[model samples]
Target: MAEETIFSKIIRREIPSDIVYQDDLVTAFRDISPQAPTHILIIPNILIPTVNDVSAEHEQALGRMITVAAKIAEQEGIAEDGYRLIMNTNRHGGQEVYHIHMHLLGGRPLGPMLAHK
Candidate 1:
């Protein structure tokens, strides 16, 4: 089995979250520490430590993540107005979860500058 990540805990229901969608490839849930009204975190079944860790083997995984992100945004009624897709890659990027995930932030006025680039 792969190493259990914080996401596994969340996926296993050990940690509570406002889950919106799920499948064999991706899991969509509300951010425990929400940054927006409809803040969701879309995580893949495969746990990659960071963006820098992705390789050719992850080409499909990478594509699926973006597709899931778009589907989630549309399902949650935030696609037309738009939303923010983020993948914070390392300690310097403020990535709290070691597992690779995408931040789907929307539902409010988002100014230009955000957290560290």
Candidate 2:
């Protein structure tokens, strides 16, 4: 639980969001700024801060995060030929939050773009 991470605030319910799903291990919420028609952000309860921080000890948390991501996409009716799961890690990875989260982007046509400069 990093003191400065927004996710810590989110996990504590100190901040508000369009939450779509929640469970013992993870939570899913609509991105404040959506990239697609059906965009969501998934966060684990463990509070690691970033995907690069994930280790073998966090396997179950990892699994839960992915499961929630898949479930949300399917539930939102974008499981077929659409949906993108993004885990931007650090500065070089386009991460905006220091707290770990996976972005579930989908619901419309998404093609290639300039991923890096």
Candidate 3:
């Protein structure tokens, strides 16, 4: 409720980034400091802070997030091997920025990176 994060500018093209795909609903870009070879972060065009801030009005944007993730994965030639698409929530969920983003991780066998025992 206080800030409009970098992702906002990042998605809008005001900030210079390796933007791969973008549309009215979503924007997908390469994560400069990437873990996987195809590490890309995708976000909704509209600002929606964190996942907790999502409402019924967000269905289209949220749905577009996954579709965009898959499309980028395939375009990067990682779909055959499969990829990990993930979204983090608040701090406990390891979300750093306030803006919502989904990560599409590929080119590595991330068996259980999303979970902990």
Candidate 4:
């Protein structure tokens, strides 16, 4: 069995999180450490561990996450100016959390994608 992740704990209400949106499949909450003026984390209730672990069955859930992120942006008033969505995969990609999650960032002019490229 896979290890229970922090996100799973948050989903189970074992941990406190500022959840903003939730459905049968996904959940959105404020990031503990804000990276932008507005930073939220969108995660699936069914943990996949990492993007590399994604399978064909997860397609719909993955799509739902994007749609959910867009909806969140509209609700947060960032739709007009736009927002950034990111999913870090593994350690090399800067994924501190093992569970699959998307970061919705906005509320200010986001700079370039890479710091040095």
Candidate 5:
């Protein structure tokens, strides 16, 4: 089995993070390395490793995470103007970490989803 990721350690409270929200299904926290004025990382309680690892078994949790992301956006005062939710997959998708997580960013107009190519 793959070794536990830093995220798993955070979920288990072995690591420290500024937690914003949490439930039986997922947890949201401020990114230690912020990419935007409002940058948050929402991750499932159960480690699914990566987006490629997601399956039917995670349908509920996955959907709930989106809803939770919206909720957090509203709570962070970025919903009306809008916010960006991103989920990088494998390495090619800019995923530095192996765990499946959503990046909630806003507080200002965001750049294009992709760079000019």
Candidate 6:
């Protein structure tokens, strides 16, 4: 079985994180090392380690993560202005954390999100 990661502690508030939103299926908190001003991490309550670890049964939680992203963006006042959602997978994707998390980054123009390359 996939073991508990830092996010597992974060979700239970066993770790220190500025948690903003939480529900049955997901939890959202601020990043310790932020890439943007309004950066936040949206994660599923259960640990799904990596994108490659995700399965068909994970659909509901994944959907919650997306909707929660919008809600957090609006709460952070970046919705209408636009924002970026990033999901890093394995090494090539620059994933430092094993637990899958969607990065909601905004509070300024994100420069097309490496949309060029």
Supply candidate 4's per-residue lDDT for 63.
87
Q: What lDDT would candidate 1 get against the real structure?
A: 0.82
What stretches of model 3 exceed 4 Å from their correct place? 114-116
Query: Which window of ten consecutive residues has the lowest lDDT sum in model 6?
Result: 108-117
lDDT of 1 at 25: 72
Q: lDDT (0-100) at residue 17 of candidate 6? A: 86
Q: Estimate each model's TM-score.
A: 0.85, 0.87, 0.92, 0.95, 0.94, 0.94
Select the stronger candidate by TM-score from 2 and 4: 4
Better of 2 and 3 by TM-score: 3
Off by over 4 Å in 5: none
Q: What tens digits encode model 3's per-residue C-alpha lDDT throughout 34-73?
A: 9888999999888889888889988998999899998888
Please identify model 2 stretches exceeding 4 Å from their true place: 113-117
TM-score of candidate 6 versus the correct structure, residues matched by position? 0.94
| Model 6 misplaced regions, further than 4 Å | none
What value does the lDDT take at residue 114 in candidate 6? 65
- Lowest lDDT block of 10, candidate 1: 108-117
| lDDT at position 78, candidate 2 | 95
Name the lDDT value of residue 24 in candidate 2: 79
Model 5 score (lDDT): 0.90
Task: Tell me the lDDT of model 6 at 110.
Answer: 89
For residues 90-115, what per-residue lDDT tens digits would candidate 4 score against the true structure?
Answer: 76689998889999999999988878
Q: Over the stretch 4-39, how does candidate 5's per-residue lDDT look in tens digits?
A: 689988877788989898888999999998988899
User: Candidate 1 on 22-65: residue-level lDDT in tens?
Assistant: 77777888888888877899887776777887889878767887
Better of 3 and 6 by TM-score: 6
Error of 3 at 63 (Å): 0.4
